[PDB]
Symmetry: D2
Subunit: 315 residues, 4 copies
């Protein structure tokens, strides 16, 4: 068919949810690729039955062969590790895994360059703002054809927690988190709206306080940790955020979505990837939007980029 071909490089917890949502939305044929033998065939078979319940017609097939990248329209990379082996859940962060996940990105980039150089790529593997640039360099793809997950996920949390306090539809809260995904993410209080109205109006009316919002900000930064400490793992919202990005691409919706992208002067920064609103459509990254940040907000953005540069050197 001229159905899109979507290759999930990595068939773990995020991979399984992505496959499920692609069939629900009838977005295209799916390949679950992994290095683990047999497992991706098992998940694919299970998932393929749901075409019946969903009134869809998407193939879902497993793969242990890199050459099945051939002909891909969209490549989604989750391959790598989720925790360090021998650290505890209380101390979960990023430093020894870096050269190893570097190696995985380099291997995957080579297979992309050979098999699907015209594919649109989404990178997920952490630390994402480092790994996305490494894959960019080794795959050879144009700068408008590769992005990383960060802001759609981080803002989903902030938007959701505010909507519960104000008793409004979650999607009616808009908000911006920039710079990097991780503990230096920059939460922009000045860019939060409710039904398109400045959040400051709701603060002046005593519907939500400054102190409540400080606690929600800390909650947003520490959410992945909060979920690990409740004896679970974040993969459902991560999968839904990635599928919103891939769907904007495939259907040429042109949504404004905060993603990691090559900076060429925005915010003062070049030769690095960082999180900012972009427009995603049929030509990929159609527009990179630069927020007109003030000096206090710029100083936080600078701290986030410096941490990406630090980990890049260790990779």
């Amino acid at each position: 068919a001229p159905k899109a071909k979507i290759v999930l490089v990595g068939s773990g917890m995020i991979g399984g949810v992505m496959a499920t949502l692609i069939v629900q939305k009838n977005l295209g044929d799916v390949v679950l690729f992994d290095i683990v033998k047999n497992m991706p065939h098992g998940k694919a078979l299970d998932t393929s039955h749901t075409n019946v319940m969903a009134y869809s017609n998407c193939k879902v097939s497993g793969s242990n062969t890199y050459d099945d990248l051939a002909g891909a329209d969209v490549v989604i990379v989750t391959a790598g590790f989720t925790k360090a082996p021998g650290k505890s859940d209380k101390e979960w962060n990023r430093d020894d895994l870096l050269p190893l996940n570097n190696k995985i990105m380099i291997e995957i980039g080579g297979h992309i360059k050979k098999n699907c150089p015209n594919a649109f790529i989404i990178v997920v593997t952490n630390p994402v703002d480092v790994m996305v640039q490494l894959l960019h360099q080794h795959s050879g793809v144009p700068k408008n054809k590769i992005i990383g997950l960060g802001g759609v996920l981080d803002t989903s949390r902030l938007k959701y927690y505010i909507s519960q306090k104000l008793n409004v539809c979650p999607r009616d809260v808009n908000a911006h988190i920039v710079g990097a995904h991780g503990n230096k993410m920059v939460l922009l209080k000045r860019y939060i709206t409710v039904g398109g109205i400045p959040l400051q109006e709701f603060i002046n009316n005593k519907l939500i306080s400054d102190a409540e919002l400080e606690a929600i900000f800390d909650r947003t930064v520490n959410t992945a940790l909060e979920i690990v400490n409740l004896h679970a793992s974040p993969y459902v919202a991560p999968a839904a955020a990635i599928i919103e990005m891939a769907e904007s691409y495939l259907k040429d919706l042109k949504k404004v979505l905060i993603c990691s992208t090559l900076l060429e002067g925005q915010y003062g920064h070049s030769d690095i990837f960082g999180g900012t609103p972009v427009v995603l459509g049929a030509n990929g990254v159609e527009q990179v939007i630069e927020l007109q940040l003030n000096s206090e907000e710029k100083a936080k953005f600078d701290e986030a980029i410096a941490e990406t540069k630090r980990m890049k050197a260790l990779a």
Copy 2:
């Protein structure tokens, strides 16, 4: 069933599209009521076949009997006239029809009070900010259970025209139009955002000019006239706006949506209906939001209310 019962009081051009979208979305059983004999049975029959294509199960039935209001969960009022008889398309506006449409609202309010006093009501008949209050008074329903169409429709236009210039997803433009539906509608430049970012940033970047935006504002105010002068009539977007409101109610989405509602001190005004953001959920109008307007914006709001009061006196 405990399926919702939705009674469309008026089975004209807007009525037919509403029925179509209710079946597409499987929102509830539908009654097409009108004073014209047989016609609502014909439209209902046609529309009922689409359950097959849509995988829905909504009854659609016509009615020429007011007592079929009994048991309604939602009542949508389009009944009345669309043009004055003997004015031309160039001079389309509001003044001789007012006592006549007054009479129609009074008759309908009596049948509501008798047959479905606990229904949620949406009024459409023009001039809407006058007719909604008349129906409120004659039906006896609580102030949180009746609204008028205006701002969802007017802002759909403004949001759409800006999104075409900036090349972004239409729903990513948010904007506010308040006070009344009609030629005195108040377009608030300061409350426009794109992907949650102040529109002023896009003006500073020369992506859209102040002059372009002035022309888009005039276009928005004159859209209903522009469509009449192209040898057609606005009913498709009006139907879609009303169904977004009714769906927020029925599914308890709690969306922020600009509608006509009883003012009790907001903006300085009492004892009148005017357009403002509200929250619609299972308890009806759950919240009335007051924008913190400046004195220049308040002065325009005052002009809009004064025109509703003028036409109310003539009704």
Copy 3:
């Protein structure tokens, strides 16, 4: 974009509903073409506002220029007349309009051949089994790239009326109507199922009688007439049936759908179009399914083809 381009050749009652449903489903960009000046621009403008309510991004534009066929992926033809001028609603049928609608198909086929020879075509104009073949011959397109509306619409009626009697989901009734669209349509009692079970089981159980089913058959054949006699016109279900066909094509769903298609030996017949189940996907008509009819059912099929051949000669 590589968004599909869908050109609606004819912007009347069916055209307006098709445009609405394409935006609801985000299926592609839309052109409303007609010979009436200005009207298609008016309908397009109205419809374009609904992208906001629907969270879609489909352009909708009017046209009075045939060359806007250039680049079309799908062409849907409703152009022509709906009643004869000077016959009454009681005597509604097909004979004086035939050479005139012949002329319209010939003109449209020439513009297709010049501007979009690789488009997938759906013909609606009545009498459909005649007009579709005329357009096939004058447009030059391959036999797997042109079909006519009939069976999806006719069976929607039969399926719906049975589902109301048995109190089951409308889409759980399956049924076949073949040969031609119109008063000689062949309703196949032996091929009706409910939840995939032979309808005869429900007859043996007295849940529905043979006599009830005879009355439902007559109702199905006379539905378009029943709607005309209730002071309305069938266009909503016709639009929904056509969009189910076009959506199967565009999304490569491969649904089994009864349409008018070139016969090459099925049922004994060649060199004519008639209604039969086909499979619609990305390569168009992927399969033509021949029902293994008995001699009594074949004799009714023969009567339907003979009536198409009669009207073809008069065209």
Copy 4:
């Protein structure tokens, strides 16, 4: 709200997918209940973020307290074990776990009877045709308010495998599997259709052979085992099948769906639960459909019931 409250009794692999699909479809508020501390709070938090991406408004909350059953509209039971501890993946089946899962059903039935006696119940825990009856007896609910998962899932497999061979939309294959869920499931060759046409027509045409269909039948029976042996586990299709059932209930769709239900004379059998087509709407099990099986098919149904009776005695 009068939003439905859906309590998932069991927050394992099937539970997590059900919660995800409920938010995607905006079906109601969700409680993830389990005996494992903290884990259901973690999964709920992750899942709650997806309201943003989905434009939904469903609460998702964890629970370790049985009394949170209070006010439930729908109760879905997955609680229990998935494998026996100390058997291998090659020998996966049903016998030592039975009294233990008996105990779990009895405990859950007591809490239902106290907290939500008017809830609609779906039982999943294996062996399902035994566990559903045990829960029926201990919960006290009416026979039209409790069902077990089996046939929607088993037939999803058979329908899907046939659709891949014939190259048609998966949902266009209809088929029936009855009696019990498990190795004695009864696959009815005579009740298979493609686009509502008897499958025998496609066999006469050599599009699919009798031998191919025998291999597909064996594949369908052994699918859960095939997935275990590929180093994965079936939970995605099971979750989608259960949500199709619960959605038919909540929205009064009245779909025909094969489920485990109390038999009162159908097929010769009373005082036991077994798989058969039923109609699910707002009053629960609205109709129990008895297939007019022949003596050879009845003999297989009898073997399936005998195996449910055997395991019931050991419980």
